[PDB]
Amino acid sequence: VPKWIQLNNEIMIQKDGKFQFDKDKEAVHSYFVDYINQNTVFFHNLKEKLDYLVENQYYEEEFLSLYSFEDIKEVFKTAYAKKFRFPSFMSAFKFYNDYALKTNDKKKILERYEDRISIVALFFANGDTEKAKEYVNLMINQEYQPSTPTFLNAGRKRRGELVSCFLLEVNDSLNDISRAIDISMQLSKLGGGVSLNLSKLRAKGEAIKDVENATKGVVGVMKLLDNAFRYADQMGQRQGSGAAYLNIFHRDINDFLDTKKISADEDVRVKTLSIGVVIPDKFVELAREDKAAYVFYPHTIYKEYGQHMDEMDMNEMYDKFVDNPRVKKEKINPRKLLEKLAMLRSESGYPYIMFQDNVNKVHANNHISKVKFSNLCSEVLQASQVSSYTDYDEEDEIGLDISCNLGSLNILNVMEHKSIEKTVKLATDSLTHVSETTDIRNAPAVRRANKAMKSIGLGAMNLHGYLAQNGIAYESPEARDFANTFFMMVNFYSIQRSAEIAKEKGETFDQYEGSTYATGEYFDKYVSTDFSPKYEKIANLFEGMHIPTTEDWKKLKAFVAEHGMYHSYRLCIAPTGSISYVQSSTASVMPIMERIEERTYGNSKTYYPMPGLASNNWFFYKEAYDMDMFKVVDMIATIQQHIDQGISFTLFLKDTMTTRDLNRIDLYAHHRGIKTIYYARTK
Amino acid sequence: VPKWIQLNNEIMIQKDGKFQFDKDKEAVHSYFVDYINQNTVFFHNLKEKLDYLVENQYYEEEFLSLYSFEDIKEVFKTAYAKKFRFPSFMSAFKFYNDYALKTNDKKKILERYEDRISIVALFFANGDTEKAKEYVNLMINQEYQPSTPTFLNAGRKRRGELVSCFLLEVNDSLNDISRAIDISMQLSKLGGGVSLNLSKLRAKGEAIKDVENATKGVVGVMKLLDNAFRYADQMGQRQGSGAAYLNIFHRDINDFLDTKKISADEDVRVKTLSIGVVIPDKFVELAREDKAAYVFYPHTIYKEYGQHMDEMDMNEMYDKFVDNPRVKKEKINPRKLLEKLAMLRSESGYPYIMFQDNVNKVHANNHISKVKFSNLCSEVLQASQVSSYTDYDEEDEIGLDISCNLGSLNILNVMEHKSIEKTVKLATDSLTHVSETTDIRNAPAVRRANKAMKSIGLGAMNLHGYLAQNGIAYESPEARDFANTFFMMVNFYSIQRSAEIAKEKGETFDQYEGSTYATGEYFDKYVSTDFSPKYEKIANLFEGMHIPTTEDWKKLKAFVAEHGMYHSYRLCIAPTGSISYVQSSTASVMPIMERIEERTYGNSKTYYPMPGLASNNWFFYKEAYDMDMFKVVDMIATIQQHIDQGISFTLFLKDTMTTRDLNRIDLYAHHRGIKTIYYARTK
Amino acid sequence: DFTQMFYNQNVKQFWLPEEIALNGDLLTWKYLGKNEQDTYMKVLAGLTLLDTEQGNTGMPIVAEHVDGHQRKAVLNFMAMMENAVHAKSYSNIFMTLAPTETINEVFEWVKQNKYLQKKAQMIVGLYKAIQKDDEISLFKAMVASVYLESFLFYSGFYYPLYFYGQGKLMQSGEIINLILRDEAIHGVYVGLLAQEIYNKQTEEKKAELREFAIDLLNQLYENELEYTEDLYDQVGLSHDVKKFIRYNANKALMNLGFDPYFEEEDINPIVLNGLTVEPLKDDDFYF
Amino acid sequence: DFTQMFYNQNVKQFWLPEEIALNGDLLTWKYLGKNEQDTYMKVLAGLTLLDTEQGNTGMPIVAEHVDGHQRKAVLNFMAMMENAVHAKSYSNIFMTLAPTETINEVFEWVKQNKYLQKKAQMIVGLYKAIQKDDEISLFKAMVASVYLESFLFYSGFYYPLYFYGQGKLMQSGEIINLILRDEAIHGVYVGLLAQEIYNKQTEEKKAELREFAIDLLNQLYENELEYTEDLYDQVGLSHDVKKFIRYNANKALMNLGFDPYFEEEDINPIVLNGLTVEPLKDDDFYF
Ligand SMILES: Nc1ncnc2c1ncn2[C@@H]1O[C@H](COP(=O)(O)OP(=O)(O)OP(=O)(O)O)[C@@H](O)[C@H]1O
Ligand SMILES: Cc1cn([C@H]2C[C@H](O)[C@@H](COP(=O)(O)OP(=O)(O)OP(=O)(O)O)O2)c(=O)[nH]c1=O
Ligand SMILES: Cc1cn([C@H]2C[C@H](O)[C@@H](COP(=O)(O)OP(=O)(O)OP(=O)(O)O)O2)c(=O)[nH]c1=O
Ligand SMILES: [Mg+2]
Ligand SMILES: [Mg+2]
Ligand SMILES: [Mn+2]
Ligand SMILES: [Mn+2]
Ligand SMILES: [Mn+2]
Ligand SMILES: [Mn+2]
């Protein structure tokens, strides 16, 4: 048992009736002094270290060559000038076991935290030494955290793709299904999560070439995708992860959900494929009135109307489909389907729930397409256009496949530094650079959509940590007030940076003219409503920072109308799973799951108290399972009104909650504007 | 119970201690008069029938448009003038249940045997009325039977491909694996069986982009392919069938073989994928000497030498691989592997055995490539070149896949009509037409190889039937003498027809100049040896038929040298299972499994005596399980010396036989020049 | 060839009533109509009464007359499941859904019911007619047992499976599904023991035993049709229940190694949703 | 007053030999002398025979004659344990430790051993003498069953316990302890049923029943002495085992409500060391 592990395990040894939280600083100090300083490869100077790293195929020389060595040395000195110290053992452990560069034999540490941050900043700056120093200050202050792919792989020759979220539209044809399998394997090989929309595939029992009862439905394609994701396991260290989304009005919806039942037969079970369901307002209306609903065979609709079922407005087309004899449909119980969804989410946490009308009533790019499905983390909500993959020697009709590179603001550190605007703009610039440097060679629609849309995802983390470290209950009205003001400011400054980038580069995203940004319909609520804090306590937290007013939003609206917007999508709140430890921040905007996180690494167990946890703020670090999920829904809906994409929203349920409680939580989320529901976690 | 079925069941009711074989003629007559005539649609004339079939999307109008209706009427009269009568109930039942065209509801019969024969002949003639009449005479006389795909689909609008056997080379890359899955699905969608060569895939535990132990091996690709074949199961009318071949020296050979163990875990077990093993003479030599053998990692060999392991001569490169430190290899026990193969074949009948050196010591196109694997039926042995499928927007290096369209000579009918030359030449013409009219637009290598090599497979059936009806024991030396003479004549006339086609079209197959036909090495044994019957009884069977001599073979050799050859491959004896009932013949060249076949169709059991079975020839209709497999191997080796491709060779084993007996049979077949062993059937 | 394999499958399927909490069924039970509640109660009592005969007589009597230690052990295990597990499970379902007085009345009614009694006494009659060292009488009883396990229970199982497939009475439906899974294997096993006896007989005796089995099936089937209408007409399900009876009759026949009697029919989708190595010797390489 | 608690205890004690991995005994077995291995095999074979008959015959026949569905459920469960669990566990032990020929030989040895045949003849004879509705014949068989459960097994149990207590053959010993734990409750339960019948009798009849019980015990005891000497003389333990069987004879008598018959003796201390879903309502869609 190592000394640092012994010190960390002393956290739970209560002394004087209170946890010994100070043992974590001792634990991290001992961890460093006894493992990291010993196992760190020694270089005489930065020049020798950089030459060794570049020569040994560690660092790409393309990005480093853009700077004179004096500039690189200055950036590295800027990174080390802060004297950054990890405040807890878990943060340093996570960094030096997951992200710190290690020799090919994985026995020595080539990168410190400062070295990794400096390399990422140099990669971001793209030759701008002052920009690189600004990025170094942003990341060393831990105001902005690049996503795990960008942070880990940036500047590395062996690096994989800096983007990790991929959404693919699958067309209803064998060629398209084969291409989807190939692209899913190609993207998983790169380590990115791949989400597929199966709503266009015809249901089981549909005809292929005037041959009836030939189609196998979406479950056969799901088995193919599950096998493909299992094969492309990314060395096996992280098993291949894929998500399949199906509209609730698809015929195969019941079979689609049955793949996640434990009682399901093994020939139907899909082990490695997450499933999400897209629920239009029509289904909720049908269940509310207890009316009998119908699930439609997609190919009959496509033949009758020449357009896909999921390409149409179900709230306008459901009655026409029901009344159309040429459309094939079978009756279902919408309330029975909702209960089945709740039961499945309780048993396995699946499927993800996407409220299509909640997403598309605020979607700015409905002209390009409506948001038909989400990603593997349930927070990516963008317009997609399906591709037409034809026969060999036939030209393909490449559509738009969704992808975004992620970054997270550290709310606590952004508020402590009073640098919301600067942090947001620098994060937007870094995300734009990552997007511009991405080129996927086996996903034509992904690459085309990356070039055309320039979609980025700027999330946030440490909301609960910041609130608890400030004497604010997560469920309290003041917490929602702060979230409203902060995320309104984030949206304002991200829109301002996008417009400024469009002005500087002279280009907007493809089909920007038809977006709600161009027509000004996006800014209606911001020019009509004031989002300043309504509580004095919350308003004081923003002291020293300028909170945009309706006049500021009017000016920004005029500026956007003049110059346009560079990004079709800017904000999405991803889970931010493992990089939160490095930042010593709570995960995303969700409430903390546990006050002290007990985990076993190797054969020694480690304890991770929530950042800033102490006796004074112990009660404010309320666990999610003890929280009223209605208040969590209220907070997420408050945040979501300023996020153009979705928010990964996990439901934390007690074992005593029935399926009716889960159904009520989902119905309240739909009522409150929640776009997606990620997971049903039960204590 | 149907009256005809009751009449047929009277076959087994012994009268005077003898089977009532005459009851089958009554059974077939009753079947016709009571079901076929009743359920046969009525048309006033042939013109009306043709119009109804064309307009109702039953026939392809293009091929029928090449004839004036007078010529079509003449062809149909030629087919009908024969007054062909099915000799048994099973023949007519099989035809009218599998191949006879039925209305879209499968309620009425639109085609009789004469109608199908006439349509096939008109499709073959490609606008030649005299040629169409010749084809009608050939088929109605039942001297030639086109393969089930051609016979069923020729001249039909809603038809699958006329070629049903495809062989795919798979390159060691993710792009190639995904393309292989896509091509397999596309080809199974067409109803054809797909065989894939997995010997170029690196073994489990190999590096993927300088990261070690990243490869899943051939078993992961096998799971992918098995799911792909299960998905593309021909609209459920016929489960997708595929075969995977692995060289015995591949490291994954034991894992590859374990996929067929009953005790195998469902994760590794492959259910719908047939497996064959390619055994070079080196492995047999190692097992014979009991020396420790090595299985190699293909990617290490490729990196060390720049070529694939299966692209190199194992008999020469085995010692170099063993002595090369940069080539990774695993020690194995060759005799233990042989015994494992024997036990696996006894338990499940797998794997197929391909003796690589037996195939290639007589292979005429080794300059194009060695034969590396076989098809799903183990009778296709052609040179293939692997394709290089690159990233999207890059140019693919299209290689050569394998596909041949099959037809079978009815040995009994050909010998009775003394029409070996005419039947062989007409069958060659029809197979050439089928190959020319075939175009797969989703398998670039298959299409390119079909256009370049012009490979056809001309098989034979009713060998045991013809011999038994002539008082010759299948295992007798006289039977082998007849097979030698007959198949020598078949090869002679197929070569002559190929040369005549090359002269008429002024074009040979791609890379013919490097073949053994061009250099004359092919004809060495034919110009130096005589194949006329050595028994007076067999020599009498050929009375009225000219048996080519050494002078004839020298003249043919000179003719080929002057004009070349149109077909790279001409002859392959496929199992020919379903259409054997229609032809009233024993399947392929194999001995009969049972004198009377008991089948269940619905709740009615049907009895099928072996064609021509009677009291006086009961002893000559010896069942295969009672024969000496060494004598069957001798027969197949006698036949195989005149077949350029392989012979689908099934082993019929008694339950008392140990794995040692199966191994001895395999070793004798390898000694006797057998190329492939299809199935190990146990009684 | 089969007893150790069935031993394994039987013991690995072991379960206890206490494992399924029943109280949550009251949340759907309260929403059923009177006819639905009445049919359910009557069906449940029917299953209970028949299963008691199987536990007290059917399985123990067969275990007594069958020779073989391993067969007796498997049969003992099956008898245990009837008496210790199934009987307690049916009682638990009843006590959860109805008050004591209602349970007593339903059992009084079903005990007097003509169609339930006809089949119960027909089966019991064949068990009582087994004679020591007479394999023909044993076979006839085994046929009766297979018909109960694989056929007669299914007019009853239909309803709980119908609810279970709709999301109603899920806890008791889970219990019924476990019971049904046991009866399926019981029917298959006893079927194999009957085929063993059948295969020891002459051709004339075989034809006579086939006639017995078909005649018995016919009598039971005609009574099942009446039983079915009596219970299910009030909830409009009889047509579909009849298809389910015939489908299960065919399974029972196949368990006895006989051909199906009835044409193949599709089943209600809601109910479906509820439902010799030897080594080479160095000379084999030379010829 | 007791069946329900015995039902619960029996079902909560349910186990299978496969739960215990036996390959750990391989070395301590290998290390025993030939005499020790011989006695051990034979001892377990004698136990196997007793459980075979207790499962096939004794428990099912008593179940048949005892009134009440719950009493029958307990007795049926106990019967299953005898032949489906206990008797089979011995084969698991044999198959691990011994080659097939030694296993074949020991089963041949049970068939020809005169003491084992005599004790089976006596016990099974009494089981098969039970007459329907004749409580006295039933009592006599229950006495025989208690003597099998609580007395006769113990000449066999001694040796696995003797090894377990020395830290030898501990996996096999774990199986045996589970078997012993079951037999102890089986002997108590059957004892209570026997006492029920005894308590119905006149004083004169009771006096005769005590005579029957004591005469039977003495007859079984005298045979068990010879059996014990035959098995244990070669390992030097006969006198020690004899003390153990007398100790357990007293426990059997006590299970029958009778006074101890043998005087107390010191037992080898080694052997002593060896011992939910709810529907959505309309109001759920409004907030
Ligand atoms: N919690 C920590 N987080 C990150 N690095 C640390 C931490 N503790 C120690 N280190 C690294 O280990 C070095 C030695 O730590 P230590 O506390 O002994 O330093 P010091 O000599 O007191 O002065 P200084 O704190 O300025 O380094 C530190 O300089 C820093 O490089
Ligand atoms: C070929 C094939 C397709 N499918 C499914 C997958 C596709 O979504 C769907 C359409 O197949 P397609 O490849 O589009 O077939 P098609 O276009 O030639 O026929 P059609 O125009 O009538 O659609 O059928 C199967 O389920 N099994 C199969 O074998
Ligand atoms: C991507 C991937 C490949 N493989 C196997 C299948 C291929 O035959 C083999 C090579 O993959 P490739 O697609 O050729 O990968 P690569 O070309 O980038 O790497 P290299 O330079 O080493 O060739 O690796 C897996 O088993 N799992 C995977 O996830
Ligand atoms: Mg299509
Ligand atoms: Mg490669
Ligand atoms: Mn039961
Ligand atoms: Mn039962
Ligand atoms: Mn016992
Ligand atoms: Mn007992």
For every residue of B398-412, DSSP letters joined together read: --B-EE-EEEEEEHH
State how beta strands B293-296 and B329-332 pair: antiparallel
| A165 annotated ligand binder | yes
Nearest to C150 by CA among C271, C38, C256, C29: C256
- Which residue has 């399947």 as its token pair? B587
* Vertex C152: Cα angle to C146 and C156 (nearest 5): 140
The answer to whether the CB of B384 falls within 8 A of the CB of B169 is yes
Resolution in A: 3.4
Instruction: Tell me how long chain C is.
Output: 287
D276 CB near a chain A CB, below 8 Å?
yes
Rounded to whole angstroms, the Cα distance separating C154 from B151 reads 48
Rounded to whole angstroms, the Cα distance separating B541 from B538 reads 5
Instruction: Point out which residues pair with A167 in neighbouring strands.
Output: A195, A402
The answer to whether the CB of B383 falls within 8 A of the CB of B140 is no
Side-chain half-sphere exposure of B205, counting CA atoms within 13 A: 9
Rounded to whole angstroms, the Cα distance separating A233 from B214 reads 9
Nearest to A628 by CA among A646, A651, A603, A597: A651
Is the CB of A203 inside a 6 Å radius of any atom of ligand 2?
A: no
3-state secondary structure labels for all residues of C138-190: HHHHHHHHHHHHHHHCHHHHHHHHHHHCCCCCHHHHHHHHHHHHHHHHHHHHH
The values of phi and psi at residue A159, to 5°, are -50, 145
Is the CB of A189 inside a 6 Å radius of any atom of ligand 3?
A: yes
The values of phi and psi at residue A18, to 5°, are -125, 150
Strands (E), B324-363: 329-332, 352-355
Rounded to whole angstroms, the Cα distance separating B140 from B82 reads 7
Q: What is the DSSP code string of C209-263?
A: HHHHHHHHHHHHHHHHHHHHHHHHGGGT-HHHHHHHHHHHHHHHHHHTTPPP-S-
Q: Output the CA B173–ligand 5 centroid distance in Å.
A: 4
The answer to whether the CB of B574 falls within 8 A of the CB of B646 is no
Taking residue B305's Cβ as centre, other Cβ atoms within 10 Å add up to 17
Which residues have CB under 8 Å from C100's CB, separation 6+? none
Rounded to whole angstroms, the Cα distance separating B460 from A18 reads 90
Residue B498 DSSP symbol: H
- In terms of Cβ atoms closer than 10 Å to its own Cβ (0-12, 13-18, 19+), residue B406 is buried
The values of phi and psi at residue B251, to 5°, are -60, -35
Sketch the domain layout of chain C as residue ranges.
1-275
Which residues have CB under 8 Å from B605's CB, separation 6+? B9, B598, B599
State how beta strands A676-677 and B273-279 pair: unpaired
Strands (E), A72-217: 144-146, 165-169, 193-197
C280 CB near a chain B CB, below 8 Å?
yes
Nearest residue, CB atoms, D76 vs list C28, C69, C84 = C84
The values of phi and psi at residue A533, to 5°, are -60, 140
A389 SS3 class: coil
Ligand 2, residue B188: give the atom nearest the CA: 29
* Distance, CA of B472 to chain centre: 26
- Name all contacts of C123-131 with Cβ < 8 Å and 24+ positions apart: C123/C50, C123/C53, C123/C58, C123/C147, C123/C148, C123/C152, C124/C53, C124/C57, C127/C53, C127/C57, C127/C58, C127/C61, C128/C57, C130/C61, C130/C65
The secondary element (H helix, E strand) that includes residue B334 is helix B334-348
CA distances to C154, C162, C236, C243 from C233, in Å: 16, 15, 5, 14
Q: Output the CA D150–ligand 9 centroid distance in Å.
A: 9
- In terms of Cβ atoms closer than 10 Å to its own Cβ (0-12, 13-18, 19+), residue A325 is exposed
The secondary element (H helix, E strand) that includes residue B659 is helix B659-671
- In terms of Cβ atoms closer than 10 Å to its own Cβ (0-12, 13-18, 19+), residue A154 is buried
Structure tokens at B621: 């209709």
The answer to whether the CB of A247 falls within 8 A of the CB of A354 is no
Residue B211 DSSP symbol: -
Q: How was this structure determined?
A: cryo-EM
The dihedral over CA atoms of B329, B331, B336, B340, expressed in degrees to the nearest 10, equals -40
Which residues have CB under 8 Å from D56's CB, separation 6+? C69, C72, D83
Ligand 1, residue A25: give the atom nearest the CA: 1
Taking residue B9's Cβ as centre, other Cβ atoms within 10 Å add up to 16
Nearest to A218 by CA among A184, A182, A177, A179: A177
- Which residue has 């040429």 as its token pair? A326
CA distances to B133, B135, B409, B452, D149 from B139, in Å: 10, 6, 10, 29, 83
Cα distance between the two ends of chain D:
55
- In terms of Cβ atoms closer than 10 Å to its own Cβ (0-12, 13-18, 19+), residue A618 is middle
**Segments in A89-173 forming alpha helices (H):** 89-94, 113-125, 129-140, 148-153
| D186 annotated ligand binder | yes
The answer to whether the CB of A252 falls within 8 A of the CB of A218 is yes
Rounded to whole angstroms, the Cα distance separating A199 from A180 reads 14
Number of H helices, E strands in chain A: 29, 15
- Which residue has 């923003």 as its token pair? A542
Rounded to whole angstroms, the Cα distance separating C122 from C41 reads 23
Closest CA–CA distance from residue A218 to any residue of chain B (Å): 11
Topology of the domain covering A143-280+334-683: Anaerobic Ribonucleotide-triphosphate Reductase Large Chain (3.20.70)
Q: Do B667 and C276 touch (CB under 8 A)?
A: no
Taking residue B62's Cβ as centre, other Cβ atoms within 10 Å add up to 9
Q: Do D279 and A339 touch (CB under 8 A)?
A: yes
The answer to whether the CB of A518 falls within 8 A of the CB of A564 is yes
Is D40 labeled as catalytic in the residue annotation? Answer: no
Taking residue D131's Cβ as centre, other Cβ atoms within 10 Å add up to 10
The values of phi and psi at residue A363, to 5°, are -65, 130
Rounded to whole angstroms, the Cα distance separating B675 from B668 reads 12
Taking residue B64's Cβ as centre, other Cβ atoms within 10 Å add up to 17
Q: Does the bond joining B2 to the residue before it have cis omega, within 30 degrees of 0? A: no
- In terms of Cβ atoms closer than 10 Å to its own Cβ (0-12, 13-18, 19+), residue A184 is buried
Q: Which residue on chain B is closest to C281 by alpha carbon?
A: B660
**Ligand 3 pocket mutation, candidates B208, B210, B251, criterion most atoms within 8 A of CB:** B208
- In terms of Cβ atoms closer than 10 Å to its own Cβ (0-12, 13-18, 19+), residue A594 is middle
Q: What is the DSSP code string of D63-84?
A: HHHS-SHHHHHHHHHHHHIIII
**Segments in A190-328 forming alpha helices (H):** 218-231, 253-258, 281-288, 298-305, 314-323
Which residues have CB under 8 Å from D150's CB, separation 6+? D183, D184, D187, D191, D248, D251, D252, D255
Rounded to whole angstroms, the Cα distance separating A136 from A116 reads 10
* Vertex D147: Cα angle to D142 and D153 (nearest 5): 130
Instruction: Point out which residues pair with A184 in neighbouring strands.
Output: none
Q: What residue owns the CA closest to ligand 2's atom 25?
A: A215
Tell me the Ramachandran region of residue D100: left when phi exceeds 0, alpha when psi lies from -120 to 50, beta otherwise: alpha
Structure tokens at A324: 């159309």
Structure tokens at D245: 């069987």
Rounded to whole angstroms, the Cα distance separating B380 from B164 reads 12
Structure tokens at B253: 């050979």
Structure tokens at C73: 């052990």
Structure tokens at B118: 């006439």
Which residues have CB under 8 Å from B340's CB, separation 6+? B254, B257
- Which residue has 């009751």 as its token pair? B6
- Which residue has 């089976």 as its token pair? D120
Position B558, amino acid: A
Rounded to whole angstroms, the Cα distance separating A553 from A569 reads 18
The secondary element (H helix, E strand) that includes residue B106 is none
Topology of the domain covering D1-275: Ribonucleotide Reductase, subunit A (1.10.620)
Is the CB of A307 inside a 6 Å radius of any atom of ligand 1?
A: no
Probe site for chain C from B335, B336, B654 (most C CB atoms < 10 A): B335
Instruction: Point out which residues pair with B573 in neighbouring strands.
Output: B647
Burial of D66-103, coded b for 16+ CB within 10 Å and e otherwise, reads: beeeebbbbbbbbbbbbbbbbbbbbebbbebbbeeeeb
The answer to whether the CB of B144 falls within 8 A of the CB of B430 is yes
Rounded to whole angstroms, the Cα distance separating B102 from B39 reads 10
Tell me the Ramachandran region of residue C213: left when phi exceeds 0, alpha when psi lies from -120 to 50, beta otherwise: alpha
* Vertex B195: Cα angle to B189 and B197 (nearest 5): 135
State how beta strands B650-653 and B679-682 pair: parallel
Q: Does the bond joining B351 to the residue before it have cis omega, within 30 degrees of 0? A: yes
- In terms of Cβ atoms closer than 10 Å to its own Cβ (0-12, 13-18, 19+), residue A367 is middle
* Vertex A563: Cα angle to A560 and A568 (nearest 5): 65
B364 SS3 class: coil
Nearest to B671 by CA among B645, B636, B628, B644: B636
Tell me the Ramachandran region of residue B657: left when phi exceeds 0, alpha when psi lies from -120 to 50, beta otherwise: beta
Instruction: Point out which residues pair with A109 in neighbouring strands.
Output: A40, A102
Cα distance between the two ends of chain A:
30
The values of phi and psi at residue B420, to 5°, are -65, -50
Is the CB of A38 inside a 6 Å radius of any atom of ligand 1?
A: no
Measured over the CA atoms of residue B433, residue B434, residue B437 and residue B442, the dihedral's sign is: negative
Residues of A in contact with D276 (CB under 8 A): 658-659
Nearest to B499 by CA among B520, B485, B478, B484: B520
Residue A546 DSSP symbol: P
Stretch(es) of chain A classified as CATH 3.20.70.20: 143-280+334-683
Taking residue A87's Cβ as centre, other Cβ atoms within 10 Å add up to 14
